[PDB]
Amino acid sequence: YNLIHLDPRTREGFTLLHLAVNSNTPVDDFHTNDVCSFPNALVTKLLLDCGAEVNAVDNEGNSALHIIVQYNRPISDFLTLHSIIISLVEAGAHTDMTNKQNKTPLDKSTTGVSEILLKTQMKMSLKCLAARAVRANDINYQDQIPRTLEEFVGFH
Amino acid sequence: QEMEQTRSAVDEDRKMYLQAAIVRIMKARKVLRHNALIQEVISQSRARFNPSISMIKKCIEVLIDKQYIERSQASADEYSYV
Amino acid sequence: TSLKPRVVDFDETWNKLLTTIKAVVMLEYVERATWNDRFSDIYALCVAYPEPLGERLYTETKIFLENHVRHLHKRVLESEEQVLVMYHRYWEEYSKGADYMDCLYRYLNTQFIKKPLMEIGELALDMWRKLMVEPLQAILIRM
Amino acid sequence: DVFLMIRRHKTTIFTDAKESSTVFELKRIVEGILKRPPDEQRLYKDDQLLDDGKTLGECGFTSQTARPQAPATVGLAFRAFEALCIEPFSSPPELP
Amino acid sequence: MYVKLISSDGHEFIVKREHALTSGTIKAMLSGPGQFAENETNEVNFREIPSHVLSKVCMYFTYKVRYTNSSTEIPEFPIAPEIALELLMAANFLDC
Amino acid sequence: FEVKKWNAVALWAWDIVVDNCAICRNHIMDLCIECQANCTVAWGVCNHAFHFHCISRWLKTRQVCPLDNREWEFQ
Amino acid sequence: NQDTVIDLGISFQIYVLQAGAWPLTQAPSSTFAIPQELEKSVQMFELFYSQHFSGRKLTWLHYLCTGEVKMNYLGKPYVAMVTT
Ligand SMILES: [Zn+2]
Ligand SMILES: [Zn+2]
Ligand SMILES: [Zn+2]
């Protein structure tokens, strides 16, 4: 908790939970290559219930969910892929965020299984659909919406 | 009938485990003779079934068709992979 | 009007809200139209330009709750013979009032408090704990 | 299932119904939720009346047409029948 | 079992109580002195949102109640370009 | 007719459309027979998902799907 | 805990079993239809399993599940129970 409340970001913007759900996380070639495997379903849950910001944003724009749904070993590593997506979504992840390329986690899902799991866990809301329609239609929302909702349209 | 079905399912799982054991041993050795490979396969599978030599030789013959293990050009006794 | 962020006068809207939340936390009668109107009042206070009057609304609600609990405490101390019955009656009233206040202040709890602070239901229960039962703890325990 | 937006001037009603059902059930639903006798409800779907016993699937709207997203409008009237004066919705503010 | 949702422009949208409890603000409006209206109607007075956006959120209540399991696929919800940014504030207020 | 009280049994499984790698007859969660002692999964256009090592060896043998007579294509 | 009051009309007890662990299978090609009086229960449990234990599919075994029956025509002589 003490570390995760310092907001530790790497040079690419990965918070301490982006790395825990990332396949491309450097594990040392020495004896840590065996025990320490990333993405980890237990490290992600430990960070989540130790107070990690699940809606943290990479410098590229990807959230913590845009990275796990890009995992390239879905069927081989279903138990890790399933339990992480379960943990993030019920830990507060917003399964509609758009990165700086304006892509939802379903759009940034290079896997059918990740799409199926996310769509199973995707809870629909009219705020999300209305924000998607506002962003997609290029409606000028500045100074016409609540300030707290300006961010909400911002990550859609 | 269900007893016979179970006693045939154990034979199918026995064949699959024998093939897996042959492939694992031939990837841990990369070359072995028939007389040594049969004994190694028998010794590896003892906590499970005791395998009849006909079953091991049938599995090692059908793995040739799948190219997991191949006979060396020197003699059919020698074995290799491809 | 509509849900566009307005520039609301905090004094008049907060006075109307004070009337309705006093009549709510005292379990008096408020018109259903008035209650649904003060949801709009809460929304307008938590959204208005140029500065969102969310923290001011939270502070004013906390001050009103403190004053109300202090008034209840003083009346209960005045009724020394039936301190116990008065505490029960005013606790039932204040519990239902805190529940209805957490209902009415749902926008603060969901958009400002949770995004630190404590929700209005939790705030009301905490004010009751720190201003109604903890001061006259000894009298209640002994009786 | 078929979802309907039964309109009567200002009073708009959102009702779920089954394709294998009659407009008898629709009239009973609207009189139960409108507190009216179950005979003055005269539907005016696209300005043409429909029989009181025929199924609403055959009335012109199917399950693939009156989806939940855009329910089919069913105008309504009551005996004093009254003229169809279905008020339109509020005008949206110009363009995005 | 049938709540009424009066809009700012007079329109009264009647939708099921189970349908209109998917929004947090209506659930809070019907929890408290707002429940003391009775008359089986349990009306709520939305003095803010116009008629078209209230109709769209009622259609969304129906759409979410229908497609909540998502067994195979949920079809797209047709937000009009003009109704967005006015349904966004409405869906924020209602916490849909 | 009606049932007053009921008792049922259900066999839950993962929602993946593919169940087993029909080369080594192994489940896809664990590793292939070549790969058990020392893996990714290769899909196909015909909804045929098998082990990467098994698919590589099979295509090294022939360009035919193990179940039907179709040309193997990657994803 | 659901919004509407759910009238199952049943005391639903189920054994949710791993597919690979148990030696059971849907070997028969029977297309047995779920009875309508408990189809509500099976649909409610499908919804519950999708809600909580998501990502899993249920293959119901209709030839290992038993339940009591109501005899409204045979003469109501107490009760009896058989398999589905
Ligand atoms: Zn492998
Ligand atoms: Zn394989
Ligand atoms: Zn194929």
Curated annotation (Swiss-Prot), chain B:
Highest taxon, organism lineage: Eukaryota
Cell location: Nucleus
Annotated effect of mutating E2K: Activates UBE2R2-mediated ubiquitin chain extension in the absence of neddylation
Cullin neddylation domain sequence ranges: 13-73
PTM remark: Neddylated; which enhances the ubiquitination activity of ECS (Elongin BC-CUL2/5-SOCS-box protein) E3 ubiquitin-protein ligase complexes. Neddylation leads to structural rearrangment in the complex that allows interaction between the E2 ubiquitin-conjugating enzyme and the acceptor ubiquitin. CBC(VHL) complex formation seems to promote neddylation. Deneddylated via its interaction with the COP9 signalosome (CSN) complex.
Glycyl lysine isopeptide (Lys-Gly) (interchain with G-Cter in NEDD8) cross-link, chain position(s): K27
Assembly: Component of multiple Cul2-RING (CRL2) E3 ubiquitin-protein ligase complexes consisting of CUL2, Elongin BC (ELOB and ELOC), RBX1 and a variable substrate-specific adapter; this complex is also known as ECS (Elongin BC-CUL2/5-SOCS-box protein) complex and may consist of CUL2 or CUL5. Component of a ECS(VHL) or CBC(VHL) complex containing CUL2, RBX1, ELOB, ELOC and VHL. Component of the ECS(MED8) complex with the probable substrate recognition component MED8. (Microbial infection) Interacts with human respiratory syncytial virus (HRSV) protein NS1.
Stated family: Belongs to the cullin family.
Name of the protein in its database record: Cullin-2
Lineage: Eukaryota, Metazoa, Chordata, Craniata, Vertebrata
UniProtKB/Swiss-Prot annotation, chain D:
Keywords noted in UniProt: Acetylation, Host-virus interaction, Nucleus, Phosphoprotein, Transcription, Transcription regulation, Ubl conjugation pathway
Domain Ubiquitin-like residues, every copy: 1-65
Gene Ontology cellular component list: Cul2-RING ubiquitin ligase complex; Cul5-RING ubiquitin ligase complex; cytosol; elongin complex; nucleoplasm; VCB complex
Highest rank taxon of the organism: Eukaryota
Keyword Nucleus attached: yes
MF (Gene Ontology): transcription corepressor binding; ubiquitin protein ligase binding
Cell cycle in keyword set: no
Pathway: Protein modification; protein ubiquitination
Subcellular location: Nucleus
UniProt record, GO biological process: positive regulation of proteasomal ubiquitin-dependent protein catabolic process; protein ubiquitination; protein-containing complex assembly; target-directed miRNA degradation; transcription elongation by RNA polymerase II; transcription initiation at RNA polymerase II promoter
Function: SIII, also known as elongin, is a general transcription elongation factor that increases the RNA polymerase II transcription elongation past template-encoded arresting sites. Subunit A is transcriptionally active and its transcription activity is strongly enhanced by binding to the dimeric complex of the SIII regulatory subunits B and C (elongin BC complex).
Family of the protein in this entry: Belongs to the Elongin B family.
Protein's recorded name: Elongin-B
Organism of this sequence: Homo sapiens (Human)
Included range, full protein: 2 to 100 of 118
UniProtKB/Swiss-Prot annotation, chain E:
Gene3D superfamilies from the UniProt entry: Potassium Channel Kv1.1, Chain A
GO molecular function: protein-macromolecule adaptor activity; transcription corepressor binding
InterPro entries for the chain: ELC1 (IPR039948), SKP1-like (IPR001232), SKP1/BTB/POZ_sf (IPR011333), Skp1_comp_POZ (IPR016073)
Localization per record: Nucleus
Tissue expression as described in the entry: Overexpressed in prostate cancer cell line PC-3 and breast cancer cell line SK-BR-3.
Pathway terms, separated by semicolons: Protein modification; protein ubiquitination
This protein's GO CC annotations: Cul2-RING ubiquitin ligase complex; Cul5-RING ubiquitin ligase complex; cytosol; elongin complex; nucleoplasm
Alphabetical UniProt keywords: Host-virus interaction, Nucleus, Transcription, Transcription regulation, Ubl conjugation, Ubl conjugation pathway
Pfam families for the chain: Skp1_POZ
GO terms under biological process: protein ubiquitination; regulation of transcription by RNA polymerase II; target-directed miRNA degradation; transcription initiation at RNA polymerase II promoter; ubiquitin-dependent protein catabolic process
Name of the molecule in the record: Elongin-C
The organism of origin for this protein: Homo sapiens (Human)
Gene that produces this protein: ELOC
UniProtKB/Swiss-Prot annotation, chain F:
Catalysed reaction, written as an equation: S-ubiquitinyl-[E2 ubiquitin-conjugating enzyme]-L-cysteine + [acceptor protein]-L-lysine = [E2 ubiquitin-conjugating enzyme]-L-cysteine + N(6)-ubiquitinyl-[acceptor protein]-L-lysine; S-[NEDD8-protein]-yl-[E2 NEDD8-conjugating enzyme]-L-cysteine + [cullin]-L-lysine = [E2 NEDD8-conjugating enzyme]-L-cysteine + N(6)-[NEDD8-protein]-yl-[cullin]-L-lysine
Subcellular location: Cytoplasm; Nucleus
Chief location of this protein within or outside the cell: cytoplasm
Single GO biological process annotation from the record: protein polyubiquitination
EC number(s) recorded for this UniProt protein: 2.3.2.27, 2.3.2.32
Mutation effect (C35A): Strong reduction in ligase activity
Keywords for the protein's UniProt record, in alphabetical order: Acetylation, Cytoplasm, DNA damage, DNA repair, Host-virus interaction, Metal-binding, Nucleus, Phosphoprotein, Transferase, Ubl conjugation pathway, Zinc, Zinc-finger
Binding sites annotated in the UniProt record for Zn(2+) 2: C32, C35, C39, H53
Record: residues binding Zn(2+) 3: C46, H48, C65, D68
Zn finger limits (RING-type): 32-69
MF (Gene Ontology): cullin family protein binding; molecular adaptor activity; NEDD8 ligase activity; NEDD8 transferase activity; protein-containing complex binding; RNA polymerase II-specific DNA-binding transcription factor binding; ubiquitin protein ligase activity; ubiquitin protein ligase binding
GO cellular component: Cul2-RING ubiquitin ligase complex; Cul3-RING ubiquitin ligase complex; Cul4-RING E3 ubiquitin ligase complex; Cul4A-RING E3 ubiquitin ligase complex; Cul4B-RING E3 ubiquitin ligase complex; Cul5-RING ubiquitin ligase complex; Cul7-RING ubiquitin ligase complex; cullin-RING ubiquitin ligase complex
